Design an enzyme around this catalytic site. Structure first.
Site, PDB file in Angstrom:
ATOM      1  N   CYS A   5     -25.039  38.912  14.525  1.00  0.00           N
ATOM      2  CA  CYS A   5     -23.656  39.200  14.874  1.00  0.00           C
ATOM      3  C   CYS A   5     -22.722  38.114  14.388  1.00  0.00           C
ATOM      4  O   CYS A   5     -22.848  36.956  14.834  1.00  0.00           O
ATOM      5  CB  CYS A   5     -23.497  39.301  16.411  1.00  0.00           C
ATOM      6  SG  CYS A   5     -21.822  39.643  16.935  1.00  0.00           S
ATOM      7  N   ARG A  46     -19.647  36.226  17.150  1.00  0.00           N
ATOM      8  CA  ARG A  46     -20.113  35.520  18.350  1.00  0.00           C
ATOM      9  C   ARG A  46     -19.186  34.420  18.860  1.00  0.00           C
ATOM     10  O   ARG A  46     -19.412  33.892  19.937  1.00  0.00           O
ATOM     11  CB  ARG A  46     -21.522  34.959  18.139  1.00  0.00           C
ATOM     12  CG  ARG A  46     -22.641  36.008  18.300  1.00  0.00           C
ATOM     13  CD  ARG A  46     -23.949  35.304  18.026  1.00  0.00           C
ATOM     14  NE  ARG A  46     -24.218  35.196  16.593  1.00  0.00           N
ATOM     15  CZ  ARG A  46     -25.157  34.439  16.076  1.00  0.00           C
ATOM     16  NH1 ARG A  46     -25.918  33.689  16.885  1.00  0.00           N
ATOM     17  NH2 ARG A  46     -25.340  34.436  14.746  1.00  0.00           N
ATOM     18  N   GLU A  78     -17.091  47.422   8.212  1.00  0.00           N
ATOM     19  CA  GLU A  78     -18.018  48.303   8.940  1.00  0.00           C
ATOM     20  C   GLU A  78     -17.597  49.748   8.773  1.00  0.00           C
ATOM     21  O   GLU A  78     -18.435  50.593   8.559  1.00  0.00           O
ATOM     22  CB  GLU A  78     -18.101  47.991  10.444  1.00  0.00           C
ATOM     23  CG  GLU A  78     -18.712  46.630  10.785  1.00  0.00           C
ATOM     24  CD  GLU A  78     -18.801  46.399  12.312  1.00  0.00           C
ATOM     25  OE1 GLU A  78     -19.816  46.838  12.929  1.00  0.00           O
ATOM     26  OE2 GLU A  78     -17.873  45.784  12.874  1.00  0.00           O
ATOM     27  N   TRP A  91     -14.898  45.003  19.017  1.00  0.00           N
ATOM     28  CA  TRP A  91     -13.936  45.653  18.136  1.00  0.00           C
ATOM     29  C   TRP A  91     -14.473  45.528  16.714  1.00  0.00           C
ATOM     30  O   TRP A  91     -15.299  44.663  16.421  1.00  0.00           O
ATOM     31  CB  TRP A  91     -12.558  45.009  18.234  1.00  0.00           C
ATOM     32  CG  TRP A  91     -12.547  43.539  18.059  1.00  0.00           C
ATOM     33  CD1 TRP A  91     -12.575  42.846  16.862  1.00  0.00           C
ATOM     34  CD2 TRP A  91     -12.461  42.547  19.091  1.00  0.00           C
ATOM     35  NE1 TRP A  91     -12.530  41.498  17.097  1.00  0.00           N
ATOM     36  CE2 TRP A  91     -12.446  41.278  18.450  1.00  0.00           C
ATOM     37  CE3 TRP A  91     -12.402  42.601  20.499  1.00  0.00           C
ATOM     38  CZ2 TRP A  91     -12.372  40.058  19.176  1.00  0.00           C
ATOM     39  CZ3 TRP A  91     -12.301  41.386  21.222  1.00  0.00           C
ATOM     40  CH2 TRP A  91     -12.279  40.140  20.555  1.00  0.00           C
TER      41      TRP A  91
HETATM   42  C1  HEM Z   1     -15.944  41.541  19.545  1.00  0.00           C
HETATM   43  C2  HEM Z   1     -16.053  41.607  18.231  1.00  0.00           C
HETATM   44  C3  HEM Z   1     -17.389  41.784  17.482  1.00  0.00           C
HETATM   45  C4  HEM Z   1     -17.480  41.824  16.155  1.00  0.00           C
HETATM   46  C5  HEM Z   1     -16.299  41.721  15.153  1.00  0.00           C
HETATM   47  C6  HEM Z   1     -18.881  42.038  15.820  1.00  0.00           C
HETATM   48  C7  HEM Z   1     -19.412  42.141  14.568  1.00  0.00           C
HETATM   49  C8  HEM Z   1     -20.673  42.563  14.241  1.00  0.00           C
HETATM   50  C9  HEM Z   1     -21.099  43.069  12.933  1.00  0.00           C
HETATM   51  C10 HEM Z   1     -20.169  43.236  11.690  1.00  0.00           C
HETATM   52  C11 HEM Z   1     -22.406  43.338  13.022  1.00  0.00           C
HETATM   53  C12 HEM Z   1     -23.334  43.891  11.908  1.00  0.00           C
HETATM   54  C13 HEM Z   1     -22.978  45.373  11.932  1.00  0.00           C
HETATM   55  C14 HEM Z   1     -23.623  46.116  10.813  1.00  0.00           C
HETATM   56  O1  HEM Z   1     -24.201  45.462   9.951  1.00  0.00           O
HETATM   57  O2  HEM Z   1     -23.573  47.371  10.798  1.00  0.00           O
HETATM   58  C15 HEM Z   1     -22.847  43.010  14.363  1.00  0.00           C
HETATM   59  C16 HEM Z   1     -24.120  43.128  14.850  1.00  0.00           C
HETATM   60  C17 HEM Z   1     -24.507  42.917  16.185  1.00  0.00           C
HETATM   61  N1  HEM Z   1     -23.726  42.502  17.263  1.00  0.00           N
HETATM   62 FE1  HEM Z   1     -21.684  42.100  17.097  1.00  0.00          FE
HETATM   63  N2  HEM Z   1     -19.621  42.000  16.977  1.00  0.00           N
HETATM   64  C18 HEM Z   1     -18.723  41.931  18.037  1.00  0.00           C
HETATM   65  C19 HEM Z   1     -19.082  41.985  19.372  1.00  0.00           C
HETATM   66  C20 HEM Z   1     -20.384  42.099  19.862  1.00  0.00           C
HETATM   67  C21 HEM Z   1     -20.741  42.181  21.269  1.00  0.00           C
HETATM   68  C22 HEM Z   1     -19.699  42.263  22.441  1.00  0.00           C
HETATM   69  C23 HEM Z   1     -22.090  42.197  21.336  1.00  0.00           C
HETATM   70  C24 HEM Z   1     -23.004  42.266  22.577  1.00  0.00           C
HETATM   71  C25 HEM Z   1     -22.537  41.933  23.799  1.00  0.00           C
HETATM   72  C26 HEM Z   1     -22.622  42.136  19.998  1.00  0.00           C
HETATM   73  C27 HEM Z   1     -23.978  42.105  19.666  1.00  0.00           C
HETATM   74  C28 HEM Z   1     -24.480  42.436  18.429  1.00  0.00           C
HETATM   75  C29 HEM Z   1     -25.862  42.708  18.120  1.00  0.00           C
HETATM   76  C30 HEM Z   1     -27.109  42.678  19.036  1.00  0.00           C
HETATM   77  C31 HEM Z   1     -25.869  42.995  16.640  1.00  0.00           C
HETATM   78  C32 HEM Z   1     -27.088  43.382  15.796  1.00  0.00           C
HETATM   79  C33 HEM Z   1     -27.355  44.831  16.172  1.00  0.00           C
HETATM   80  C34 HEM Z   1     -28.522  45.320  15.347  1.00  0.00           C
HETATM   81  O3  HEM Z   1     -29.456  44.514  15.068  1.00  0.00           O
HETATM   82  O4  HEM Z   1     -28.505  46.519  14.978  1.00  0.00           O
HETATM   83  N3  HEM Z   1     -21.559  42.006  19.132  1.00  0.00           N
HETATM   84  N4  HEM Z   1     -21.788  42.483  15.068  1.00  0.00           N
HETATM   85  C1  QJ2 Z   2     -25.866  53.052  15.621  1.00  0.00           C
HETATM   86  C2  QJ2 Z   2     -26.441  51.654  15.540  1.00  0.00           C
HETATM   87  C3  QJ2 Z   2     -27.276  51.144  16.555  1.00  0.00           C
HETATM   88  C4  QJ2 Z   2     -27.790  49.846  16.407  1.00  0.00           C
HETATM   89  N1  QJ2 Z   2     -28.599  49.281  17.326  1.00  0.00           N
HETATM   90  N2  QJ2 Z   2     -27.468  49.101  15.317  1.00  0.00           N
HETATM   91  C5  QJ2 Z   2     -26.665  49.576  14.340  1.00  0.00           C
HETATM   92  C6  QJ2 Z   2     -26.349  48.672  13.185  1.00  0.00           C
HETATM   93  C7  QJ2 Z   2     -25.429  47.576  13.741  1.00  0.00           C
HETATM   94  C8  QJ2 Z   2     -24.231  48.179  14.461  1.00  0.00           C
HETATM   95  C9  QJ2 Z   2     -23.392  47.139  15.189  1.00  0.00           C
HETATM   96  C10 QJ2 Z   2     -21.969  47.620  15.125  1.00  0.00           C
HETATM   97  C11 QJ2 Z   2     -21.000  46.788  15.978  1.00  0.00           C
HETATM   98  C12 QJ2 Z   2     -21.193  46.542  17.346  1.00  0.00           C
HETATM   99  C13 QJ2 Z   2     -20.279  45.811  18.094  1.00  0.00           C
HETATM  100  C14 QJ2 Z   2     -20.561  45.598  19.576  1.00  0.00           C
HETATM  101  C15 QJ2 Z   2     -19.129  45.340  17.466  1.00  0.00           C
HETATM  102  C16 QJ2 Z   2     -18.976  45.611  16.093  1.00  0.00           C
HETATM  103  N3  QJ2 Z   2     -17.904  45.215  15.385  1.00  0.00           N
HETATM  104  N4  QJ2 Z   2     -19.897  46.313  15.397  1.00  0.00           N
HETATM  105  C17 QJ2 Z   2     -26.127  50.861  14.426  1.00  0.00           C
END
Ligand code: HEM
Ligand code: QJ2
Ligand code: HEM
Ligand code: QJ2
Ligand code: QJ2
Ligand code: QJ2
Ligand code: H4B
Ligand code: H4B
Ligand code: CL
Ligand code: CL
Ligand code: CL
Ligand code: CL
Ligand code: ZN
Ligand code: ZN
Ligand code: ZN
Lengths: 412, 408
Positions: B107, B110, B284, B279
């Site tokens: 993420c 963070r 994305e 958000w």
């Molecule tokens: C608030 C603004 C946030 C932004 C801009 C953001 C951004 C992102 C992005 C761009 C990704 C990769 C998405 C992709 O590759 O499709 C990601 C992954 C992830 N984020 Fe965030 N995030 C935010 C908030 C959060 C929050 C609130 C949580 C949990 C409380 C979180 C937990 C995670 C996790 C666990 C992943 C990896 C999910 C996976 O492995 O599929 N994020 N984040």
């Molecule tokens: C449908 C889906 C489920 C999952 N576990 N992982 C993915 C790939 C990562 C999606 C995370 C998208 C996201 C999640 C949050 C919380 C914020 C943000 N800007 N973007 C897709």
């Protein structure tokens, strides 16, 4: 062990068995992945013969002569040579096979579809820096081929005791000087400031322009390195212009046509070739993204976006992205108009995926380093972005080695 | 064991000591790096996991080794011995949730980790209760476009027969339908899930952007269907600040990204239904959702409308069209006052966050393959940043889709 990789765009699944021949270290453990770390975090007889035997077994398998009289005789011959002299000499055929394989195995290289078409220049009879210069000029002229670029490698004598190393001190055969000014600005290429200072110290008369081709600094047989100027008529360069923006040419940009890495070490059969410059042709983004748009390089993004009159008040107008695309258009257009070989990042990655699938099918795998394979712009609209990869070390291989100014024992 | 990372653009070198606290597995070995592989290739075990967490909790509130620390460890040991599990205090739950985000190596967002609103839904017992909790989460998080980060935490796993699950992969997503034509209408990512919804009785509108219903499982019961009130789903029509024809593509996207299929592990306890939202970062939507071949796949249509030379890849028509789509996404969200972040701004904040974490925590696990944006990678500051990926708990984890696990 069968390992599977998936492509997330196509759902195609491939199975890797080749990783079972992997060696040495990735740097990773079960607790820590070092996949985005750039660098790793005098050989003896007992380690040498096994490495020799394993290479020669691969070589003989490849020519469909495994376990033949010739194979067994060659193992014997090398064994005795190692016992009697503490090293051995590769046959020309083994050298060629080795060098081709080091490229085939190079996990950070997106251009490997081309691996079997490598011109190998055997320079193991070279004894002096002047001899090295002549070999390197011939390599440049052959590889350049008036714009019709041909892949090549020149292989100088192998390491013996580590006190007689052949080295090209340049990181690439052709690169531009960088000069730090008293006011903290940089003229030319900031990547090459330290090397430029060395050249000047060694007696180079620097022109102090923005695109000065550096001299070659060449070390033979562990001697102090010597300076040589590549004949200017051998250095093909392309002025950079844009197909619609007539002001782009007045940025005064140009680049050289020949990418030629000269600071890596080639390991074949446990032997170490510390000077083995190799060259191919550019993918456009190496110049347009990295060389021109890195902050620690020519750094032209702002200037370009100014001329395009982009909204530079906020990053969210994506002004940087817009300028980045136009710059890369300009490089591709400039090289193509001058008939100098270049490949765009869409074409090179499409070819890489075809190569990779072919390797999995015919070889059982294709080690590939995603962090380096994926292009530095537009990553996810290229077919490598969604491709899972496995990174591991096969030999023959190319390896990093320390910069020679850090380790050279100066004679005087 | 005592590791350095270099930024190759700035020469800044940072030392990681936090990796000493790492756990489970990366999937990598000394022979083979699995950095680009997307998925992971009883009472006895529980108390060590609980102790590990409670030790980190008590340390964080400057009370390590205190009577209260020892009494709590005592209390939890007793509880596990007698009930085979334990219950987290509210403070411990909030801390664990925030740290699971802090530890999320994929993420980029963070820097925001400590500002997470945690909704304790451990008292929920039915799918109807889940639905009410999720609507409230949605409304709170959306906040009329001024989005706020939130997580809602349903009851923990017990014997694994009584799992709470949200079957949807995100709370808000668009249906996908395979056509008689052989093409796909809507989002191709969601074809299988849509089918399940239809099988379960959902009356499908059969449009290009149909918000999927929720499929909610409580206490290991068969999942039930609910429609999110349409008025709680904030959407943005996509237009371009310069191309008038852009709006004629008829594109829109929803404002709230809310992942609902992951598992939250805190102190050995497993929260299988834990939808969390933030958000969007613009790419994305603009790069992944719109431009992936297996998604809405609009690159060709946009390029055609821009009248670019599509005959040769080297005209970079794909790259030009990609940039314009991403400009439109950001412009549209901004013009409607819906929180969004561009990739330059998000990655700059992540670098600031990462330096803080190294300074104050001794590291920041980060997965480069995921952190680097999917367009213009090397002109963002994360590209040149070496990162170390390792697994810290509390954590978010993948779990199997429940339609492969659930017995009806
Ligand atoms: C608030 C603004 C946030 C932004 C801009 C953001 C951004 C992102 C992005 C761009 C990704 C990769 C998405 C992709 O590759 O499709 C990601 C992954 C992830 N984020 Fe965030 N995030 C935010 C908030 C959060 C929050 C609130 C949580 C949990 C409380 C979180 C937990 C995670 C996790 C666990 C992943 C990896 C999910 C996976 O492995 O599929 N994020 N984040
Ligand atoms: C449908 C889906 C489920 C999952 N576990 N992982 C993915 C790939 C990562 C999606 C995370 C998208 C996201 C999640 C949050 C919380 C914020 C943000 N800007 N973007 C897709
Ligand atoms: C033929 C055209 C070629 C193309 C288009 C090509 C493309 C590239 C690119 C884009 C990179 C990454 C550069 C960067 O990120 O800065 C690279 C790396 C590399 N290539 Fe190639 N390549 C070609 C030929 C060759 C040849 C002939 C060899 C050796 C015989 C070679 C061996 C390598 C190695 C060892 C690396 C990794 C360098 C490092 O770790 O610093 N390539 N290639
Ligand atoms: C100066 C320098 C030395 C080195 N070993 N590695 C790097 C980074 C990778 C450079 C590879 C450049 C290259 C090399 C070749 C042979 C073809 C091609 N298109 N591009 C830079
Ligand atoms: C995945 C991978 C591939 C590869 N070719 N090289 C590496 C790094 C191995 C580092 C140690 C090997 C080494 C290092 C040096 C300096 C010389 C030499 N002959 N061998 C990793
Ligand atoms: C680098 C990394 C980070 C992370 N959070 N997770 C991983 C995957 C490790 C495997 C996790 C094992 C697991 C699996 C399941 C299903 C639940 C649970 N609580 N734990 C790797
Ligand atoms: C194979 C490859 O790792 C896979 O497609 C990844 C690459 N990087 C990614 N990075 C992000 N942020 N999101 C993704 O979905 C992916 N996909
Ligand atoms: C830390 C990071 O891995 C480092 O800057 C790498 C990232 N990926 C790269 N990929 C390529 N092709 N070339 C590079 O120089 C880099 N730099
Ligand atoms: Cl770069
Ligand atoms: Cl770079
Ligand atoms: Cl994507
Ligand atoms: Cl994706
Ligand atoms: Zn760079
Ligand atoms: Zn790894
Ligand atoms: Zn994608």
């Amino acid at each position: 062990r069968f390992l599977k990789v998936k492509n997330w765009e196509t759902d195609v699944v491939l199975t890797d068995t080749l990783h079972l021949k992997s060696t040495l270290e990735t740097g990773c453990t079960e607790h820590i992945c070092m996949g985005s770390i750039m660098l790793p975090s005098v050989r003896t007889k007992d380690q040498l013969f096994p490495l020799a035997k394993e290479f020669l077994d691969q070589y003989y398998s490849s020519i469909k002569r495994f376990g033949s009289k010739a194979h067994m005789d060659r193992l014997e011959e090398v064994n005795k040579e190692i016992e009697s002299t503490s090293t051995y000499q590769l046959k020309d055929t083994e050298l060629i096979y080795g060098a081709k394989h080091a490229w085939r195995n190079a996990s950070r290289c997106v251009g490997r579809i081309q691996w079997s078409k490598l011109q190998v220049f055997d320079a193991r009879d070279c004894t002096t820096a002047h001899g090295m210069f002549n070999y390197i000029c011939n390599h440049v002229k052959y590889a350049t081929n008036k714009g019709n670029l041909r892949s090549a490698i020149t292989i100088f004598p192998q390491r013996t005791d580590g006190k007689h190393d052949f080295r090209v001190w340049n990181s690439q055969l052709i690169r531009y000087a960088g000069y730090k000014q008293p006011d903290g600005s940089t003229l030319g290429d900031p990547a090459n400031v330290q090397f430029t200072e060395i050249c000047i110290q060694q007696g180079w008369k620097a022109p102090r322009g923005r695109f000065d081709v550096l001299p070659l600094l060449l070390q033979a047989n562990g001697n102090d390195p010597e300076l040589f100027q590549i004949p200017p008529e051998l250095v093909l360069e392309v002025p950079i212009r844009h197909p619609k923006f007539d002001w782009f040419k007045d940025l005064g940009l140009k680049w050289y046509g020949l990418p030629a890495v000269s600071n890596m070490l080639l390991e074949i059969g446990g032997l170490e070739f510390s000077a083995c410059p190799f060259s191919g042709w550019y993918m456009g983004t190496e110049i347009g993204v990295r060389d021109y748009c890195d902050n620690s390089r020519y750094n032209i993004l702002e200037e370009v976006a100014k001329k395009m009159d982009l909204d530079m008040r906020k990053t969210s107008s994506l002004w940087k992205d817009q300028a980045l695309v136009e710059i890369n258009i300009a490089v591709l257009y400039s090289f193509q108009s001058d008939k100098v070989t270049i490949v765009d990042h869409h074409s090179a990655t499409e070819s890489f995926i075809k190569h990779m699938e072919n390797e999995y099918r015919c070889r059982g795998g294709c080690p590939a380093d995603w962090v380096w394979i994926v292009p530095p712009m537009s990553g996810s609209i290229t077919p490598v972005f969604h491709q899972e990869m496995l990174n591991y070390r096969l030999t023959p291989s190319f390896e990093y080695q320390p910069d020679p100014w850090n380790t050279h024992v100066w004679k005087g």
